[PDB]
Structures are given as structure tokens and as C-alpha cells.
Amino acid sequence: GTGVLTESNKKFLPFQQFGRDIADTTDAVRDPQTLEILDITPCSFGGVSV
Amino acid sequence: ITPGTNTSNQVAVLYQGVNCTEVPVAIHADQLTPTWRVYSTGSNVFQTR
Amino acid sequence: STECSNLLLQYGSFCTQLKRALTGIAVEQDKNTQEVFAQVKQIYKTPPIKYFGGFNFSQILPDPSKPSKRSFIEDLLFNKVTLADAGFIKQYGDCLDLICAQKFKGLTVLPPLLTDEMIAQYTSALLAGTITSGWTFGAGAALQIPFAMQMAYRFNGIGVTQNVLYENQKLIANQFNSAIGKIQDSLSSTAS
Amino acid sequence: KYFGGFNFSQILPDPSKPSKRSFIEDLLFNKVTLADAGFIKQYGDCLG
Amino acid sequence: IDRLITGRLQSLQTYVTQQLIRAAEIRASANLAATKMSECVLGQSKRVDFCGKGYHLMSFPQSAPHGVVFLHVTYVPAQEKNFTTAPAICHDGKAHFPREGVFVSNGTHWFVTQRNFYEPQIITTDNTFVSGNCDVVIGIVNNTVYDP
Amino acid sequence: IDRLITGRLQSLQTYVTQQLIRAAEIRASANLAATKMSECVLGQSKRVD
Amino acid sequence: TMSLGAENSVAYSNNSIAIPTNFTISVTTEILPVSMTKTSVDCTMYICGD
């Protein structure tokens, strides 16, 4: 996927590995490497008008 | 039928378009929402249009 | 088909907004009648004496000689429209042939909140208010006024002096009664 | 602000408040703002 | 992915149709609101029970989120009283009718007053207009008419 | 069976859309009827025709 | 069963009128929606996110 990864304030429980949102989007992920709880946010978009 | 959870938790159940006596809905176990019993032998049952 | 329902569960909450839309439509239908008819805070009753300046309102005021308190015109309208209706019964007692087939496919009809008797009562109250009070009952407490005076003031409203009605009251009452009879005959005719 | 003895202070705007809205308009706004999903003030900075 | 794309496209089409329906409803509501604004705030409306309940006097608009609020000031009559009344007054063999009021009597003497407020006055030739005689009007009551 | 479910669901959605359009038309007619009742029964209207 | 309203009887008569002797100035509110939320949808992201 594509997005902006940033440090997260989510308090993942030890068994919890994947975060999610209201609609089936993994907005939080756990690093398979050295442990780090991470947020996933799609990078900036929007409409273009003339 | 509910008066709002902020006021009370007891509710009234309306069965749409079925005759109470002609349809003895109080069968023993095998119905949808089987935990529901609402036999209501003490509390009266009102048949509306 | 339980397995069909199980596989339909994978389609997400689509029946939720359909059910919500149908419920909103039903509530809107109830509110339409609630707004068009329930416009009076009191149920006015016509006096036992039915003399109003010589005018005849027997065809539009309800009579107690019927189980349903409806006038002759209301009965004619109901008979004219009763060719097609909801079905007049929804208690499953007689359903073991057109409504039954739709019901067996999960297509039910919700009865209206206001019965025909209550709508007839609203119409009777409106008739009593507009006959015994004119337009005063629509802007506050109902004020009694003779029907001749009310018609004279309506004539003054349309720009005709009051003496015209007070001199042609018999003719105007006869014309109104003839018009009411003509309307009744036209409604009773086969041409709906 | 004298109109034949009538009182219009509750519907005329008050210049003291930075937003030129009357008392009744403020009450209406506060009543409606209990549920306001139209957050046009949010932008791409919403990454918390 | 064809299946998911078709499902999501159908969902978007349904949402657009619902939005169009609500847009039509809001258009009708806004047209009604503009008509009420024009006919109650910018002027006095004789349409009964249109600018509030009662006899409309004036309306003050108030801005609201995603809508408008009208403060309809209405004139509501109150504290009525029984009054015997007659449609015409006979003075000298000719019937008299009120100019713009009613004929009322407190049980002893007859008076003429405006229809929306009990302001009794003496029956006077300038308060009434003569039309015809006193044998064609039903309920006419004989009484003197003051000539000033 | 997915094809059949999609077809039936689309038919139901079209029926609901038609019902919504008819409900909007009936609501407009009912608003007009309420306005006419208010302006002609509860009072005398100077509006022409 | 619903109560339509309080029963009322008007003292109608051949010669009887009710002329109010006082009045009440009544102010009543009326709320009408005018516009709703303006929204736009991006198909390229809603249908196929990234």
C-alpha cells in the first residue's frame, strides 16, 4: 500500500498486531523488525479546480 | 416499543399482522430469537388492528 | 434457504438503509395526514338544531345513523374508491389471493396511524368550526356567529355589500342547496 | 434602540461579540452544534 | 476485483440517487422558506395560518445552521363575551347595515362595534348605510339611528 | 447465485428509488392540500382561482 | 387510543355573536431547512484505494 507512516499513540496489546479503523482500513501496523507501533495514513490528496 | 434507555429498560413487543390466538407464537424452543419467551400469562396481551 | 442468507450476509449492510428508507416513507405518509387534517386543537360539535340561515348541510355533516360517523359525500367517495384498497384485513386469519401472494414474499402493508373514523372526526370538527364560527376558530378560540352574518362578511370580503345577501338570502340558500345536490348527483354517477 | 417601547435586543446583533450574531442566533447555533460533521476546517494536517 | 468494483460502483450510484432525492426535497423546502421570507418579513400576508398561527402582524428572520428560523408575531383575540346581535336596524321603515362592524346589544341598548374588538358606539347615520325597507331582511330589529 | 442476488438486490433498489420519488410527489401534493385547507377552510382567500 | 382533542361545543344561535374584548400578541418560531452539506466523491480512490 501507499501512505504516510508516522509514530502512533495507539497502545497495542501484546497479542494485537494490526490496527484498523471504522471501515476495514489498516491504519495502524506493527513493525516486523524491532518493535515499533506505526500509523498508516494515505498521503495528501484532494480535488483540483480551475 | 421502548420508552428510551435513559428512562426505563422494560420494552413492549409488537408482532406485525398476526392474530394472537390464531397464531400461538409461544412455541417451546425452536424459533428465531429462541431466548425470547414473552409468554405473558400474567401481563395482558392486546390484539390491535 | 439458510445458506443463501449466510452468503448474503457477506454483502454488508444493504438492507439497513432500505429498511430505513421504507420506514421514513411510512412516517412521512403518516405525517402528511397528521398535518393536512389535524389542524384544530378542539373537536367542535355541531348544535342539535341544523338551521343555518336556511342553508342545508345535511349532505356533509356526519350522522349517527351509521356505524362509521361519515357524511353522505364521504360514503360516496369511499364507495367510489373501495374498488382497490389495502385489503381491509391484515390479521392472517383468512389468508389460508393477490395480497396473500405478496405477503408470502415479504411484502407487507403497514396500517395508517389515523383510522378513517378519526379522519372523519377531524373533517366534522372542521365543518363545525367553519359553520358555527367562520374563520375565527382558525386564529384562536372559536367565536359563534350566525351563518347569515358570516356569509355577509364573506361577501364584504369579495367586494359585495352586505345588503345583497340580506336581501337575496332565500335565493342564495336555494342556489347553494341545488349546487350541493348537483355535486352529490355527479359523485353518485358512474363517471368517477 | 427605542422602537415604540418594544424590545429587540434579543434579535438585533451585538457588536461586542466578535461574531455579529444575535442572542437567539447564538442559541440556535449552540443547539445545532451538538452534532456537526461538516468539519471544513480539517485539512491534510489531520495525521494524529 | 470486478465483483468488488461493481458492488462499490452500485453503492456510489445509490448514494448519488439518495443525494439527488434529498436535494430535490431541500430545494422545495428552500423555495418555501424564500416564499415565507418574502411574504412575511418583507410584508404582511393575509394568508391565514401561513406566517404563524393567528392574525399575522410581522415576522423577524433568524439565521440557523443549514436553515432559517422565523419569529412570527401574530394577533390572537382573547376574552370574548356573549352578545345578542341583529343583521339590520330599522329606524324609519328603511333598513340600516353596519359600515365595517357588527350590531351588538348588551341586553338594553344596541351598539355598533368593529368585528375584532369590542368597542361599542352609538348607531349613527355615518356609521351605517341605508338599503331597502324593513320587510325583506330576516331578523331585522327596530331601533333608533342617531342623526347628528 | 451471486448473479441472482445482485439482480434481485438491484430490482429491490430500483423499487425503493421509485417509492422514494412517488413519496416526494405525494408529500408535495399533501403540502399543497394542507395549504389549501388552511387558506380556504380556516379562512377566506383572495388568491385568484 | 389516541385523543384527537378536547370536545368542544359552540353556542350557536340565531342571534348570538362572540366579540373579543382583549387580545394576545403571540410570537411563534418556525424552522425551515434551506441548504445541506455540500459533498464531493473521488471514484479513483473510493473504488480502488492505492
Ligand SMILES: *[C@@H]1O[C@H](CO)[C@@H](O[C@@H]2O[C@H](CO)[C@@H](O[C@@H]3O[C@H](CO)[C@@H](O)[C@H](O)[C@@H]3O)[C@H](O)[C@H]2NC(C)=O)[C@H](O)[C@H]1NC(C)=O
Ligand atoms: C337537506 O337536503 C336533504 C337531501 O336533499 C333533504 O333530505 C331529503 O328529504 C326529502 C323529503 O323532504 C326526501 O325525499 C323523500 O325521501 C323518502 C325517504 O327516503 C323517499 O321514500 C321519497 O321517495 C322521497 O325521495 C329525500 O330522500 C331526503 N334526502 C336525504 C339524502 O335524506 C333534507 O330534507 C334537506 N333539509 C332541509 C332543511 O331542506
Ligand SMILES: *[C@@H]1O[C@H](CO)[C@@H](O[C@@H]2O[C@H](CO)[C@@H](O[C@@H]3O[C@H](CO)[C@@H](O)[C@H](O)[C@@H]3O)[C@H](O)[C@H]2NC(C)=O)[C@H](O)[C@H]1NC(C)=O
Ligand atoms: C430588553 O431586554 C433585555 C434582555 O436581555 C434587557 O436586558 C437585560 O435586563 C435584565 C433585567 O433588567 C438584566 O438583568 C439584571 O442585570 C443586572 C446588571 O447585570 C443585575 O444586577 C441583575 O441582578 C439582573 O441580572 C440583564 O443584565 C440585561 N441584559 C441582558 C444581556 O440580559 C433590557 O433591559 C430590556 N430593555 C431594554 C430597553 O433594552
Ligand SMILES: *[C@@H]1O[C@H](CO)[C@@H](O[C@@H]2O[C@H](CO)[C@@H](O[C@@H]3O[C@H](CO)[C@@H](O)[C@H](O)[C@@H]3O)[C@H](O)[C@H]2NC(C)=O)[C@H](O)[C@H]1NC(C)=O
Ligand atoms: C348597557 O349599556 C348602556 C350604555 O352603556 C347602559 O346604560 C347606562 O347605564 C348607566 C347606569 O349607571 C348610566 O350611568 C348613569 O348616567 C347618568 C347620566 O345619564 C348619571 O347621572 C348616573 O350617575 C349614572 O352614571 C348611563 O348613562 C347609561 N348609558 C346610556 C347610554 O343609557 C346600560 O346600563 C347597560 N345595560 C347592561 C345590562 O349592562
Ligand SMILES: *[C@@H]1O[C@H](CO)[C@@H](O[C@@H]2O[C@H](CO)[C@@H](O[C@@H]3O[C@H](CO)[C@@H](O)[C@H](O)[C@@H]3O)[C@H](O)[C@H]2NC(C)=O)[C@H](O)[C@H]1NC(C)=O
Ligand atoms: C387584557 O389582557 C391584559 C393581559 O392579560 C391585561 O393586563 C393585565 O392586567 C392585570 C390586572 O390589571 C395585571 O395583573 C397585575 O399583576 C401584578 C402581579 O404583581 C399585580 O401587582 C398588579 O396589581 C396586577 O394585578 C397583569 O400584569 C396585566 N398583564 C400585562 C401583560 O400587563 C388587561 O388588563 C386586559 N384588559 C381587559 C380589558 O381585559
Ligand SMILES: *[C@@H]1O[C@H](CO)[C@@H](O[C@@H]2O[C@H](CO)[C@@H](O)[C@H](O)[C@H]2NC(C)=O)[C@H](O)[C@H]1NC(C)=O
Ligand atoms: C319594530 O317597530 C316597528 C314600529 O315601531 C314595527 O312596525 C310595525 O309594522 C306593522 C306591520 O304592518 C304595523 O302594523 C305596525 O303598526 C308597526 N308598528 C307601529 C308602532 O306602527 C315593527 O313590526 C317592529 N319589528 C318587529 C320585528 O316587531
Ligand SMILES: *[C@@H]1O[C@H](CO)[C@@H](O[C@@H]2O[C@H](CO)[C@@H](O)[C@H](O)[C@H]2NC(C)=O)[C@H](O)[C@H]1NC(C)=O
Ligand atoms: C332559529 O330560527 C329558525 C327559523 O326558521 C327556527 O326554526 C324554526 O323554529 C320553529 C320554532 O317553533 C319551528 O316550528 C320550525 O319548524 C323551525 N324550522 C323552520 C324551517 O321554520 C329555529 O328554531 C331558531 N333557533 C333558535 C335557537 O332560536
Ligand SMILES: *[C@@H]1O[C@H](CO)[C@@H](O)[C@H](O)[C@H]1NC(C)=O
Ligand atoms: C531483529 O529483530 C528483533 C525482533 O524482536 C529485534 O529485537 C532485533 O533488534 C533485530 N536485530 C537486528 C540486527 O535487526
Ligand SMILES: *[C@@H]1O[C@H](CO)[C@@H](O)[C@H](O)[C@H]1NC(C)=O
Ligand atoms: C435522561 O432524562 C433526564 C430527565 O428525566 C435528563 O435530565 C437527562 O439529561 C437524560 N439523559 C440522557 C443521556 O439523555
Ligand SMILES: *[C@@H]1O[C@H](CO)[C@@H](O)[C@H](O)[C@H]1NC(C)=O
Ligand atoms: C383471531 O382468532 C380468533 C379465533 O379464531 C377470532 O375469534 C378473532 O376474531 C381473530 N382475530 C382477528 C382475525 O383479528
Ligand SMILES: *[C@@H]1O[C@H](CO)[C@@H](O)[C@H](O)[C@H]1NC(C)=O
Ligand atoms: C354564551 O351563552 C351560552 C349559553 O348561556 C354558553 O353556552 C356560552 O358558553 C356563552 N359564551 C361565552 C363566551 O361565555
